Amino acid sequence: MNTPEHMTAVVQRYVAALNAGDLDGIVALFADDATVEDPVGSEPRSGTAAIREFFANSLKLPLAVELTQEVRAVANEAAFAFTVSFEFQGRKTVVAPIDHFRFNGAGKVVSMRALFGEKNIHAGA
Amino acid sequence: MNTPEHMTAVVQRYVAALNAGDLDGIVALFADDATVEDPVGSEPRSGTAAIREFFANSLKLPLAVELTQEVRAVANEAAFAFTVSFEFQGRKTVVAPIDHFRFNGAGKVVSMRALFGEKNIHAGA
Ligand SMILES: C[C@]12CC[C@H]3[C@@H](CCC4=CC(=O)CC[C@@H]43)[C@@H]1CC[C@H]2OC(=O)CCC(=O)O
Ligand SMILES: C[C@]12CC[C@H]3[C@@H](CCC4=CC(=O)CC[C@@H]43)[C@@H]1CC[C@H]2OC(=O)CCC(=O)O
């Protein structure tokens, strides 16, 4: 139950800001102090300065964000994945990680997680 | 930077017990009191009588479990997905959810999560 369309909107805008590298929109979609678990087995960063200081550090990498499968959203939380098509200084590498989500009931984004690894990455020519 | 071969092994055995509907290999792969989380709304099950009583009740439904994509395993945790092909009161329904994993080293399992929803299900012909 629970229209997953609302939880999916956060994922859209969440990435729409990624694709456009508009952190301002990410922090916007991120509660005043939402929590983000990343990297894995690492330490999250709660707060707008943290969520941004974090998501911002991720934007420092000029890549392309474009989902590929179907976003997942259940209960007040949610989970989705995408691919990062960045470029190197002579080669082109892409990645295929996934992200988690933690809302509070149509009240913007509260917490968030991120899953991936050197196996969900890519290395082609 | 870690070898997911060990963690992924849990996902294998974890499902090998599923494919064989052997709750034993499941609880076996599960610590003496691992932690579960399902379906999606604060419904975990710690201990063995709970993890098994759960993973067992899940086996009560006759379906087919056979991963197809790539399992995910990072740090001491991990995440994977697959598809479920079971039958209904007359038609055949399949399912495409994703599960999570929480280990404590590389010998057995301790905690585990799950993700999906009515969108990751499969109803039709
Ligand atoms: C900083 C980083 C780009 C930004 C992402 C970060 C991993 C965690 C993360 C999760 C998100 O949902 C936003 C992107 C950020 C990545 C880890 C490495 C990196 O970029 C790469 O993928 C490196 C690829 C390479 O070296 O080939
Ligand atoms: C109990 C349950 C079967 C067991 C799984 C549970 C969802 C959570 C779950 C995650 C796992 O990794 C083990 C299976 C359990 C399912 C939710 C519904 C159900 O079975 C169905 O898929 C119902 C399909 C239908 O009739 O539409």
XYZ file of C-alpha atoms and ligand atoms in Angstrom:
304
model
C 0.000 0.000 0.000
C 1.080 3.662 0.173
C 1.278 5.204 -3.319
C 4.925 4.566 -4.193
C 4.646 7.505 -6.618
C 5.346 10.003 -3.813
C 8.404 8.125 -2.522
C 9.562 7.850 -6.154
C 9.336 11.636 -6.611
C 12.077 12.093 -3.998
C 14.232 9.672 -6.027
C 13.513 11.629 -9.228
C 14.228 15.120 -7.975
C 16.984 13.504 -5.912
C 18.641 12.384 -9.160
C 17.264 15.221 -11.323
C 19.546 17.327 -9.117
C 22.285 14.736 -9.650
C 21.944 14.723 -13.447
C 21.938 18.534 -13.347
C 24.490 18.497 -10.500
C 22.086 20.807 -8.642
C 23.031 19.996 -5.028
C 20.837 22.950 -4.064
C 17.991 20.649 -5.121
C 19.496 17.637 -3.357
C 19.805 19.465 -0.037
C 16.338 20.844 -0.818
C 14.921 17.328 -1.227
C 17.027 16.450 1.831
C 15.378 17.352 5.161
C 17.015 20.236 7.071
C 19.302 17.574 8.540
C 18.522 14.322 6.697
C 20.940 11.427 7.304
C 22.947 9.716 4.539
C 24.798 6.403 5.023
C 27.879 6.494 2.794
C 30.177 5.171 1.889
C 29.168 1.634 2.936
C 30.708 0.460 6.231
C 31.538 4.167 6.631
C 29.951 7.061 8.558
C 26.912 9.013 7.338
C 26.549 12.803 7.639
C 23.361 14.269 9.114
C 22.428 17.959 8.782
C 22.143 20.244 5.742
C 25.848 21.172 5.816
C 26.707 17.466 6.158
C 24.200 16.052 3.649
C 25.410 18.791 1.287
C 29.088 18.817 2.314
C 28.729 15.117 1.489
C 26.505 15.031 -1.599
C 28.545 18.069 -2.679
C 31.824 16.139 -2.402
C 30.127 13.544 -4.626
C 29.144 16.212 -7.166
C 32.805 17.300 -7.321
C 33.068 14.369 -9.752
C 31.738 15.467 -13.146
C 29.723 12.417 -14.251
C 26.345 11.612 -15.819
C 23.432 10.375 -13.688
C 20.670 8.482 -15.523
C 18.578 5.735 -13.893
C 18.123 2.521 -15.910
C 15.891 0.115 -13.981
C 12.838 0.885 -11.816
C 13.140 2.882 -8.576
C 11.961 1.009 -5.457
C 9.907 2.585 -2.643
C 8.046 0.895 0.245
C 6.497 2.020 3.553
C 7.965 5.390 4.613
C 11.409 4.305 3.361
C 12.504 3.554 -0.214
C 15.396 2.175 -2.297
C 16.595 2.914 -5.844
C 19.656 2.545 -8.091
C 21.331 4.310 -11.029
C 24.564 4.367 -13.047
C 27.423 6.887 -12.981
C 28.966 7.475 -16.421
C 31.994 9.614 -15.525
C 35.125 10.090 -17.656
C 38.830 9.793 -16.792
C 41.832 11.739 -18.135
C 42.129 9.449 -21.177
C 39.727 6.558 -20.489
C 35.981 6.236 -19.807
C 34.697 4.302 -16.777
C 31.074 3.897 -15.623
C 29.536 2.542 -12.390
C 26.353 0.693 -11.362
C 25.652 1.276 -7.673
C 22.354 1.619 -5.778
C 20.949 4.031 -3.175
C 18.524 3.693 -0.252
C 15.958 6.155 1.092
C 14.266 6.983 4.417
C 11.298 9.399 4.393
C 8.844 10.092 7.243
C 5.455 10.150 5.468
C 5.364 12.608 2.543
C 7.518 14.988 4.613
C 10.519 15.306 2.283
C 13.629 13.138 2.702
C 14.788 12.168 6.214
C 17.484 9.460 6.121
C 19.214 7.760 3.173
C 21.621 4.873 2.495
C 23.924 3.836 -0.371
C 24.974 0.342 -1.490
C 27.605 -0.691 -4.055
C 31.217 -1.855 -4.245
C 34.064 -2.586 -6.686
C 31.730 -5.209 -8.183
C 28.973 -2.743 -9.036
C 31.531 -0.520 -10.792
C 32.573 -0.808 -14.459
C 35.748 -0.668 -16.578
C 35.305 -0.667 -20.373
C 37.096 1.153 -23.214
C 38.592 -2.788 -1.192
C 37.525 -6.288 -0.078
C 36.755 -9.697 -1.626
C 32.977 -10.132 -1.745
C 33.613 -13.816 -2.546
C 33.219 -14.664 1.160
C 30.202 -12.408 1.757
C 28.639 -13.443 -1.569
C 29.023 -17.057 -0.417
C 26.393 -16.236 2.215
C 24.046 -15.050 -0.564
C 24.644 -18.362 -2.366
C 24.197 -20.717 0.545
C 21.522 -18.295 1.753
C 19.559 -19.059 -1.424
C 20.892 -22.615 -1.863
C 18.917 -23.239 1.337
C 16.023 -21.327 -0.239
C 16.072 -23.268 -3.517
C 16.146 -26.424 -1.382
C 13.524 -24.932 0.965
C 15.870 -26.111 3.737
C 15.294 -23.608 6.558
C 18.219 -25.431 8.212
C 20.858 -24.135 5.779
C 19.159 -20.753 6.159
C 19.287 -20.616 9.958
C 22.664 -22.346 9.630
C 23.920 -19.499 7.440
C 22.238 -17.301 10.058
C 24.131 -16.728 13.330
C 22.668 -18.344 16.473
C 20.486 -15.250 16.817
C 20.944 -13.265 13.587
C 18.521 -10.392 12.884
C 15.903 -10.247 10.103
C 13.846 -7.333 8.713
C 10.643 -8.006 6.782
C 8.521 -7.382 5.087
C 8.919 -3.575 5.174
C 7.726 -1.603 8.221
C 9.765 -2.541 11.319
C 9.095 -6.307 11.305
C 12.484 -7.866 12.042
C 13.102 -11.218 13.781
C 16.231 -11.725 15.914
C 17.377 -15.059 17.398
C 16.935 -18.431 15.661
C 13.349 -19.382 16.574
C 12.400 -16.005 15.055
C 14.673 -15.911 11.982
C 13.753 -19.523 11.157
C 10.089 -19.262 12.202
C 10.120 -16.367 9.723
C 12.321 -17.617 6.885
C 10.361 -20.854 7.395
C 6.924 -19.212 7.150
C 8.277 -17.577 3.983
C 9.051 -21.053 2.626
C 5.391 -21.973 3.246
C 4.750 -20.306 -0.128
C 5.744 -22.581 -3.019
C 7.842 -20.399 -5.358
C 11.047 -20.619 -7.404
C 14.173 -18.729 -6.293
C 17.044 -18.368 -8.785
C 19.153 -15.179 -8.787
C 19.934 -13.770 -12.251
C 21.620 -10.376 -11.901
C 24.735 -9.775 -9.769
C 24.639 -10.146 -5.969
C 25.936 -7.141 -4.001
C 28.276 -7.444 -0.998
C 30.259 -4.561 0.550
C 31.992 -4.092 3.916
C 30.581 -6.517 6.510
C 27.119 -6.073 4.954
C 25.758 -6.874 1.480
C 22.669 -6.575 -0.754
C 21.194 -8.823 -3.467
C 17.997 -9.405 -5.452
C 16.290 -12.079 -7.570
C 12.884 -13.244 -8.786
C 10.173 -15.506 -7.350
C 8.001 -17.688 -9.614
C 5.120 -19.188 -7.612
C 1.519 -20.080 -8.552
C -1.782 -18.479 -7.478
C -5.336 -19.780 -6.932
C -5.416 -20.386 -10.706
C -2.955 -18.113 -12.552
C 0.833 -17.847 -12.107
C 2.390 -14.842 -10.328
C 6.108 -14.000 -10.078
C 7.991 -11.544 -7.808
C 11.089 -9.332 -8.241
C 12.159 -8.023 -4.836
C 15.648 -7.321 -3.440
C 17.168 -8.507 -0.146
C 19.922 -7.020 2.032
C 22.643 -8.657 4.122
C 24.521 -7.858 7.354
C 27.573 -9.947 8.330
C 30.113 -9.487 11.151
C 33.274 -10.881 9.509
C 33.249 -13.664 6.893
C 32.201 -16.978 8.483
C 28.432 -16.747 9.048
C 25.572 -14.218 8.964
C 24.292 -11.936 11.754
C 21.796 -9.358 10.453
C 19.893 -9.097 7.157
C 17.427 -6.676 5.536
C 14.929 -6.916 2.655
C 13.397 -4.461 0.160
C 10.537 -4.624 -2.365
C 6.862 -3.683 -2.614
C 3.642 -4.185 -4.602
C 5.567 -2.672 -7.533
C 8.288 -5.316 -7.497
C 5.625 -8.049 -7.650
C 4.349 -9.727 -10.844
C 0.627 -10.239 -11.534
C -0.801 -11.236 -14.937
C -0.409 -14.195 -17.324
C 33.277 9.937 -5.429
C 32.480 8.820 -6.158
C 31.445 9.603 -7.012
C 30.206 10.005 -6.131
C 29.545 8.786 -5.429
C 30.583 7.990 -4.579
C 29.925 6.738 -3.956
C 28.825 7.095 -2.987
C 27.793 7.954 -3.743
C 26.470 7.594 -3.681
C 25.394 8.485 -4.347
O 24.231 8.138 -4.362
C 25.836 9.788 -4.970
C 27.157 9.585 -5.645
C 28.259 9.240 -4.571
C 31.737 7.584 -5.506
C 32.886 6.655 -5.007
C 34.002 6.844 -6.090
C 33.482 8.024 -6.902
O 33.478 8.072 -8.148
C 33.723 6.931 -8.809
O 32.825 6.163 -9.135
C 35.166 6.578 -9.166
C 35.233 5.768 -10.465
C 36.680 5.417 -10.811
O 37.636 5.778 -10.202
O 36.769 4.635 -11.899
C 5.141 -13.978 2.544
C 5.812 -13.572 1.203
C 6.705 -14.794 0.851
C 8.066 -14.715 1.637
C 8.825 -13.381 1.397
C 7.928 -12.152 1.735
C 8.673 -10.836 1.414
C 9.908 -10.659 2.263
C 10.814 -11.884 2.036
C 12.131 -11.675 1.710
C 13.094 -12.878 1.571
O 14.242 -12.709 1.212
C 12.563 -14.253 1.896
C 11.155 -14.365 1.400
C 10.227 -13.363 2.189
C 6.643 -12.259 0.902
C 5.582 -11.115 0.900
C 4.313 -11.800 0.287
C 4.702 -13.272 0.268
O 4.511 -14.038 -0.700
C 4.147 -13.476 -1.865
O 4.970 -13.113 -2.697
C 2.656 -13.284 -2.157
C 2.387 -13.203 -3.663
C 0.895 -13.009 -3.942
O 0.035 -13.765 -3.625
O 0.644 -11.864 -4.599
